[PDB]
């Protein structure tokens, strides 16, 4: 059920939800997938994460225009790395309102990323302050705590079985958490478990670098992270 559109892949996950996949080919390492979400919410589209590049992100907007033909009201990006925020200029050139964690926007210049137009803030329990995320419709934004990065956020789609862990969550078969160089190894396990507790009805876990998985992706990520403490 995948649709290819130039160098991009779209997979419908629900009546109103698609996963977008873009690829960066590294010589001698191969193509690396990064996944985000496209959500149809009545008469508008909401995007979660850019593609690796502006050109790839422009192609996402072209696919949306062709397959959904509704305006993109906003995009939320889940941390200040290239796979999630590489395409901010393409969103801005299209007049799309962009949202990120205030900390993502603060880190963005140091990470070589373009900051979102708007900053999200979070309660002590991890839930987004609603006034910083106006008209997010079914997007439920949760800051689980530091893990993959200090700024990583997650998004549940209300009225679906879908929760997006971004780069925080690894698939249930992963051999490791990958590169722990700039990770928060102390808090990673608790952040993974908080994401799980925030979206208890999510049975489909979408993540940046694997195919959609079961809640076993959350437990496996947390148990791998338990061995870092």
């Amino acid at each position: 059920g995948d649709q290819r559109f130039g160098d991009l892949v779209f997979r419908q996950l629900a009546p109103n939800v698609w996963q977008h996949t873009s690829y960066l080919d590294m010589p001698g390492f191969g193509a690396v997938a990064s996944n985000g979400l496209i959500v149809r919410d009545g008469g508008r589209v909401l995007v979660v994460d850019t593609a690796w590049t502006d050109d790839q992100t422009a192609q996402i907007l072209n696919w949306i225009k062709q397959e959904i033909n509704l305006p993109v009201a906003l995009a939320v990006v889940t941390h200040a790395h290239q796979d999630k925020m590489g395409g901010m200029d393409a969103l801005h050139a299209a007049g799309i309102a962009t949202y990120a964690n205030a900390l993502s926007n603060q880190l963005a210049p140091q990470e070589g990323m373009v900051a979102a137009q708007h900053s999200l803030t979070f309660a002590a329990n991890g839930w987004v302050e609603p006034a910083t995320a106006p008209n997010f419709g079914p997007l439920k934004v949760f800051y689980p705590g530091p893990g993959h990065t200090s700024d990583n956020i997650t998004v549940g789609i209300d009225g679906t079985d879908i929760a997006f862990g971004g780069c925080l969550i690894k698939d249930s078969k992963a051999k490791s958490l990958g590169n722990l160089g700039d990770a928060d190894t102390e808090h990673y396990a608790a952040s993974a478990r908080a994401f799980g507790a925030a979206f208890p009805k999510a049975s489909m876990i979408v993540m940046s670098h694997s195919a959609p998985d079961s809640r076993a992706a959350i437990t496996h990520t947390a148990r791998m992270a338990d061995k870092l403490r």
Binding site: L24, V32, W52, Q82, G178, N179, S208
Partner: peptide, 8 residues
């Protein structure tokens, strides 16, 4: 080069 899971 900060290419997500590739640290370069």
């Amino acid at each position: 080069x900060x290419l997500x899971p590739v640290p370069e």
